[PDB]
Design a protein around this nucleic acid. Structure first.
Ligand SMILES: [Mg+2]
Ligand SMILES: [Mg+2]
Ligand SMILES: [Mg+2]
Ligand SMILES: [Mg+2]
Ligand SMILES: [Mg+2]
Ligand SMILES: [Mg+2]
Ligand SMILES: [Mg+2]
Ligand SMILES: [Mg+2]
Ligand SMILES: [Mg+2]
Ligand SMILES: [Mg+2]
Ligand SMILES: [Mg+2]
Ligand SMILES: [Mg+2]
Ligand SMILES: [Mg+2]
Ligand SMILES: [Mg+2]
Ligand SMILES: [Mg+2]
Ligand SMILES: [Mg+2]
Ligand SMILES: [Mg+2]
Ligand SMILES: [Mg+2]
Ligand SMILES: [Mg+2]
Ligand SMILES: [Mg+2]
Ligand SMILES: [Mg+2]
Ligand SMILES: [Mg+2]
Ligand SMILES: [Mg+2]
Ligand SMILES: [Mg+2]
Ligand SMILES: [Mg+2]
Ligand SMILES: [Mg+2]
Ligand SMILES: [Mg+2]
Ligand SMILES: [Mg+2]
Ligand SMILES: [Mg+2]
Ligand SMILES: [Mg+2]
Ligand SMILES: [Mg+2]
Ligand SMILES: [Mg+2]
Ligand SMILES: [Mg+2]
Ligand SMILES: [Mg+2]
Ligand SMILES: [Mg+2]
Ligand SMILES: [Mg+2]
Ligand SMILES: [Mg+2]
Ligand SMILES: [Mg+2]
Ligand SMILES: [Mg+2]
Ligand SMILES: [Mg+2]
Ligand SMILES: [Mg+2]
Ligand SMILES: [Mg+2]
Ligand SMILES: [Mg+2]
Ligand SMILES: [Mg+2]
Ligand SMILES: [Mg+2]
Ligand SMILES: [Mg+2]
Ligand SMILES: [Mg+2]
Ligand SMILES: [Mg+2]
Ligand SMILES: [Mg+2]
Ligand SMILES: [Mg+2]
Ligand SMILES: [Mg+2]
Ligand SMILES: [Mg+2]
Ligand SMILES: [Mg+2]
Ligand SMILES: [Mg+2]
Ligand SMILES: [Mg+2]
Ligand SMILES: [Mg+2]
Ligand SMILES: [Mg+2]
Ligand SMILES: [Mg+2]
Ligand SMILES: [Mg+2]
Ligand SMILES: [Mg+2]
Ligand SMILES: [Mg+2]
Ligand SMILES: [Mg+2]
Ligand SMILES: [Mg+2]
Ligand SMILES: [Mg+2]
Ligand SMILES: [Mg+2]
Ligand SMILES: [Mg+2]
Ligand SMILES: [Mg+2]
Ligand SMILES: [Mg+2]
Ligand SMILES: [Mg+2]
Ligand SMILES: [Mg+2]
Ligand SMILES: [Mg+2]
Ligand SMILES: [Mg+2]
Ligand SMILES: [Mg+2]
Ligand SMILES: [Mg+2]
Ligand SMILES: [Mg+2]
Ligand SMILES: [Mg+2]
Ligand SMILES: [Mg+2]
Ligand SMILES: [Mg+2]
Lengths: 135, 72, 132, 109, 177
RNA sequence: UGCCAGCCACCGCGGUCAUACGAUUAACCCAAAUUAAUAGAUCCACGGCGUAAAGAGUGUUUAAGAAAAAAAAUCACAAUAGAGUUAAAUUAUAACUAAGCUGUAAAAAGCCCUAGUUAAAAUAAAAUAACCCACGAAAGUGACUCUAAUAAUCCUGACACACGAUAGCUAGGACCCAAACUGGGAUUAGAUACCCCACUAUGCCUAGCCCUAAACCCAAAUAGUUACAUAACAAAACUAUUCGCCAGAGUACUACUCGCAACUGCCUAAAACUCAAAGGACUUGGCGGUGCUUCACAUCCACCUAGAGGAGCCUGUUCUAUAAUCGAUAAACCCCGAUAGACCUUACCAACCCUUGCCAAUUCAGCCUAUAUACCGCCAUCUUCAGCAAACCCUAAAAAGGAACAAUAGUAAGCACAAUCAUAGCACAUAAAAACGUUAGGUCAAGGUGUAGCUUAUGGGUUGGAAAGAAAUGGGCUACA
């Protein structure tokens, strides 16, 4: 037979070792292939413990400064009048244009928000987009 | 379950209270009886001291009050 | 619970002859009759005799042929002669089988005062209808 | 518990044994009062031949006679030992058979 | 899940995002493995319980000369093989999960069981799934049909190439003799 | 030998077939020693304290200790103690009005100085907000307002100090309503209870005691961590510093001590003796005058018909009577073994008789003698119930369990049910069938047997004799027109 114990260790462990004890008289296929190209981590069993107390996760939330602008864009106009497409990999929205204009007026060295925001709005007015202006 | 321990206690208590009711005055005797021994042993305790310290009489102004028999 | 002529369910390993696996209510439906004679028909006589007779030939064949009898013994009565069929297991060396053939036929014929005919069908092992 | 506690309380001592019916001696000499009979505890039933005896310790004690058959008369002297009898309540003392006024339980040959 | 914490990239507004670099590193190794088994002429069993994709995965597998099991999974299946399938039988050399779950959102039995039987396992873990018993994981999205289709056709192709290459090297073997 | 005589260190053995007794027969093991007894050596806890024995009712400090950095912010507002106040309801007591009013499952007693309405102080208690979770050390605290006011630059700490729900005790007030006790009323075999009705100590205030709770969140304080890790169950697992507590179960919230405004009290708290257990959590059953759904189809209720219990008689039991069968005897006995006793049957009693006394042979026959709790046979019964069971497979372990169909660990031939047969074509109906077990259910008197007994007799024959009714009852038959 073999060893059906799912907890003990990786299949690699059990198999290699049972052959090592010469119980298993036939080397299995996936075994040799495995030796050749092992995976990153051994497939070993772990209890999925819950977290208590002060322990949080290691995930880093995802934010850009672009977003700190977009916040203000949606704060003014809302979602773009052009709608959206998640099928089209290159899609630029009204929002993204706004962000670009604002980046270039940032490279124009204006520190005041009113100027940056409004003049960027003038750039997009000159681009013929409809800015709804909701309070 | 643990009630089965409490049952015993409950019974033993009840069966005791009942007892102490019937036996009340017998009890009352033997209590006071020992208080009159207490007060006496107490007394002897001090008497022992005069006689041990060489004095003949109990020292001046000593009535040796009764503590144990204190009532009302 | 009817215990009549029945064979109980085991742990499931018990070998059973087709006959012993078919319970009394099954006669004339699946199972057949082990004997045949005129005696139980409407207008007929001497049923009793053929019954005693039959019984004695059951015991007789079980005793003359030890350990070699396969399934219950099939009697037929035809026009005064008996035709006794047996399923017999192969144990004995054939000489002994024919010794007992002659022995039986003669002995019975002179006992029941009517000519007896004997037939042995030999079988390698008891037929198994169920379980096993 | 904690270390200061284990210090303050010392290490545990093994408590001295409580002496039994024979009060520590291997056997006792005894004198018969009344031969009689007792009934066993529940799951099993019989009737056991017991004695009442006095011990050289001047204490009176109920004891048990082993074997079938005996002669035990008042004022007879016996020897006793500390076998407790598993059938009966509170009989902790066996009579030694074979000594003094109890001879070896007789043989039927 | 708690065991995805390393494979993740980060939370975008509450939705979690896998690391695609890691996806490629992993998937490479997975596909390589798949292939090397196919070439060595052994059974491959795809498995998913997921309904949307059932058809795909059979339609994929039937075309690979590989087997799918997309259905209710009878209990003792791999563990008690000879009783369920037949008097003596060969078992999947490699099991490949396109979803790691059952429709009740527990881990599919086949995971515990493959792992129980010394079968290697290649499957797509998702942010909720538990990777730890799977031999070769690929972290990635199981749910969106572009993703299922992608993984399907990829394992399909790895299989096909292994089989072709097998045939070829056999012909060369035959010329050399 | 038959729960007797007796044996055992613990579990236990003896109730007719004892490897446990007593004695043989074989063995085992020690061996000039061998057993028994009694003392030792050895033997708890560097383990624990939610459910098992164990975190004290609460806080502070002394004694004694332990120590990187951060470690006082605010009530989402109900600590406490004062002083003042009242919205709802209720009650006195008047004015009318009607005879009832109250009260239960149903009533009774009770009150008509009652009831409805309209007025109205005191006393007591604080709807909603509260699906909130604050304040206090804990007990506790939630109507309103104002006064005073919530220790410690914050570690642990007592037998010291100060508090401590209810109930209770002492003195004085209060008294709407509630209410131990008690008296009526029902219920009941009884009802010192549950239900009803009154009414009291008492809950209320002021002052003084008493110091107990399932004072329990059964989870000690102060810093930490979520690493390692599932006995079970419950509130998931653990470090470090401390103090407090636990050495089988009863006995025992007990006996004696000590101290206390207690003197049927509180606190502290043993031993003799008895037992081989006592405990915690779980597992399948079974059970439930628990809850919920769904049924009963001759079936519980409601309903329909025809009868039993009364009368005469038939016949079976049970009792008395007899010298004079046995068996059945809740459902599952009682026109039952009997589809069958004048002799016979026949097993019974009374007398007489016969001893290889049916057979081919046998120190052998023959036995309706004791075991149905040794049995095979045949059956009853749950049951017109759906389950039983090998072979496997799974379960951070398994005593056992193992399904969900947009399916979650089950597969499995077998025996049951179902299906088919029979009731001369269908169909339904009836018949049959109906496992595994259960009731040590029935039967050694159908027959056969294991164990025991009888052998000039518990064996075998001949002749007679039994089966009477004071009653009591089961089932029938025939009536009452
Ligand atoms: Mg008691
Ligand atoms: Mg005293
Ligand atoms: Mg029947
Ligand atoms: Mg002894
Ligand atoms: Mg007797
Ligand atoms: Mg014997
Ligand atoms: Mg022994
Ligand atoms: Mg013996
Ligand atoms: Mg010696
Ligand atoms: Mg030790
Ligand atoms: Mg614990
Ligand atoms: Mg406890
Ligand atoms: Mg104790
Ligand atoms: Mg506490
Ligand atoms: Mg304290
Ligand atoms: Mg207490
Ligand atoms: Mg100091
Ligand atoms: Mg520190
Ligand atoms: Mg006041
Ligand atoms: Mg008012
Ligand atoms: Mg009023
Ligand atoms: Mg009024
Ligand atoms: Mg009512
Ligand atoms: Mg009245
Ligand atoms: Mg409320
Ligand atoms: Mg609250
Ligand atoms: Mg404070
Ligand atoms: Mg302190
Ligand atoms: Mg108090
Ligand atoms: Mg009070
Ligand atoms: Mg009053
Ligand atoms: Mg008043
Ligand atoms: Mg009142
Ligand atoms: Mg009364
Ligand atoms: Mg009653
Ligand atoms: Mg009641
Ligand atoms: Mg009153
Ligand atoms: Mg109060
Ligand atoms: Mg409390
Ligand atoms: Mg509680
Ligand atoms: Mg406590
Ligand atoms: Mg403390
Ligand atoms: Mg503190
Ligand atoms: Mg840690
Ligand atoms: Mg468990
Ligand atoms: Mg003790
Ligand atoms: Mg108390
Ligand atoms: Mg006391
Ligand atoms: Mg004290
Ligand atoms: Mg009826
Ligand atoms: Mg019924
Ligand atoms: Mg009638
Ligand atoms: Mg009548
Ligand atoms: Mg009779
Ligand atoms: Mg009589
Ligand atoms: Mg009888
Ligand atoms: Mg009987
Ligand atoms: Mg019966
Ligand atoms: Mg009848
Ligand atoms: Mg007669
Ligand atoms: Mg006789
Ligand atoms: Mg008897
Ligand atoms: Mg029986
Ligand atoms: Mg039987
Ligand atoms: Mg079924
Ligand atoms: Mg099972
Ligand atoms: Mg037909
Ligand atoms: Mg039918
Ligand atoms: Mg029937
Ligand atoms: Mg059928
Ligand atoms: Mg019986
Ligand atoms: Mg009976
Ligand atoms: Mg017999
Ligand atoms: Mg016999
Ligand atoms: Mg005779
Ligand atoms: Mg006669
Ligand atoms: Mg009558
Ligand atoms: Mg009639």
């Amino acid at each position: 037979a073999g060893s059906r114990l799912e907890t003990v260790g990786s299949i690699f462990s059990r198999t290699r070792d049972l052959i090592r004890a010469g119980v298993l008289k036939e080397k299995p296929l996936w075994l040799d292939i495995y030796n050749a190209f092992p995976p990153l981590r051994e497939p070993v069993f772990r209890r999925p413990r819950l977290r208590y107390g002060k322990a949080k996760a290691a995930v880093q939330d995802i934010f850009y400064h672009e977003d700190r602008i977009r916040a203000k864009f949606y704060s003014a106009y809302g979602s773009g009048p052009k709608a959206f497409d998640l099928f089209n990999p290159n899609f630029k929205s009204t929002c993204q244009r706004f962000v670009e204009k604002y980046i270039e007026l940032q490279r124009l060295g204006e520190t005041d928000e009113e100027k940056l925001f409004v003049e960027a709005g003038k750039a997009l007015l000159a681009e013929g987009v409809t800015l709804r202006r909701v309070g | 379950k643990n009630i089965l321990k409490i049952r015993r206690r409950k019974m033993n208590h009840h069966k005791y209270r009942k007892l102490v009711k019937r036996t009340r005055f017998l009890r009352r005797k033997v209590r006071e009886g020992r208080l009159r021994q207490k007060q006496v042993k107490f007394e002897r305790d001090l008497k022992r001291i005069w006689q041990k310290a060489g004095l003949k009489e109990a020292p001046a102004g000593w009535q040796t009050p009764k503590i144990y028999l204190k009532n009302q | 619970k009817n215990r009549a002529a029945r064979v109980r369910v085991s742990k499931g390993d018990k070998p059973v002859t087709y006959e012993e696996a078919h319970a009394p209510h099954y006669i004339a439906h699946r199972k057949g009759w082990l004997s045949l004679h005129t005696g139980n028909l409407d207008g007929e006589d001497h049923a009793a005799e053929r019954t005693v007779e039959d019984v004695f030939l059951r015991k007789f064949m079980l005793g003359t042929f030890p350990g070699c009898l396969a399934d219950q013994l099939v009697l037929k009565r035809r026009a005064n002669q008996l035709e006794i069929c047996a399923l017999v297991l192969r144990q004995l060396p054939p000489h002994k089988f024919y010794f007992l053939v002659g022995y039986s036929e003669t002995l019975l014929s002179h006992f029941y005062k009517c000519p007896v005919h004997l037939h042995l069908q030999t079988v390698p092992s008891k037929v198994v209808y169920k379980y096993i | 518990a904690t270390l200061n506690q284990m210090h303050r309380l010392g290490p545990p001592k093994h408590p001295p044994g409580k002496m039994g019916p024979t009060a520590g001696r291997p056997q006792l000499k005894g004198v018969v009062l009344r031969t009689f009979i007792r009934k066993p505890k529940k799951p099993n039933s019989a009737n056991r031949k017991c004695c009442r005896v006095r011990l050289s310790t001047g204490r009176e004690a109920v004891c048990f006679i082993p074997g079938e058959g005996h002669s035990l008369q008042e004022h007879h002297v016996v020897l006793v030992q500390g076998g407790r009898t598993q059938d009966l309540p509170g009989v902790k003392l066996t009579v030694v058979r074979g000594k003094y006024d109890c001879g070896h339980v007789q043989k039927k040959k | 899940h708690r065991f995805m914490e390393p494979y993740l990239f980060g939370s975008r507004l509450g939705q979690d995002i896998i690391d695609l670099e890691q996806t490629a590193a992993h998937l490479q190794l997975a596909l390589n493995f798949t292939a090397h088994v196919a070439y060595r002429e052994g059974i491959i069993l795809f498995v998913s319980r997921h309904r949307q994709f059932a058809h795909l995965i059979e339609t994929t597998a039937r075309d690979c000369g590989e087997y799918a099991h997309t259905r209710y999974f009878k209990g003792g299946l791999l563990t008690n093989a000879p009783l369920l399938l037949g008097p003596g039988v060969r078992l999947p050399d490699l099991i490949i999960f396109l979803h790691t779950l059952n429709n009740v959102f527990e881990p599919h039995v086949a995971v515990r069981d493959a792992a129980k039987m010394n079968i290697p396992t290649v499957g797509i873990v998702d942010t909720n799934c538990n990777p730890a018993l799977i031999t070769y994981p690929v972290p990635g999205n199981d749910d969106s049909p572009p993703a299922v289709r992608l993984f399907c056709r990829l394992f399909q192709v790895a299989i096909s190439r292994a089989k072709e290459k097998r045939r070829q090297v056999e012909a060369l073997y035959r010329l050399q003799g």
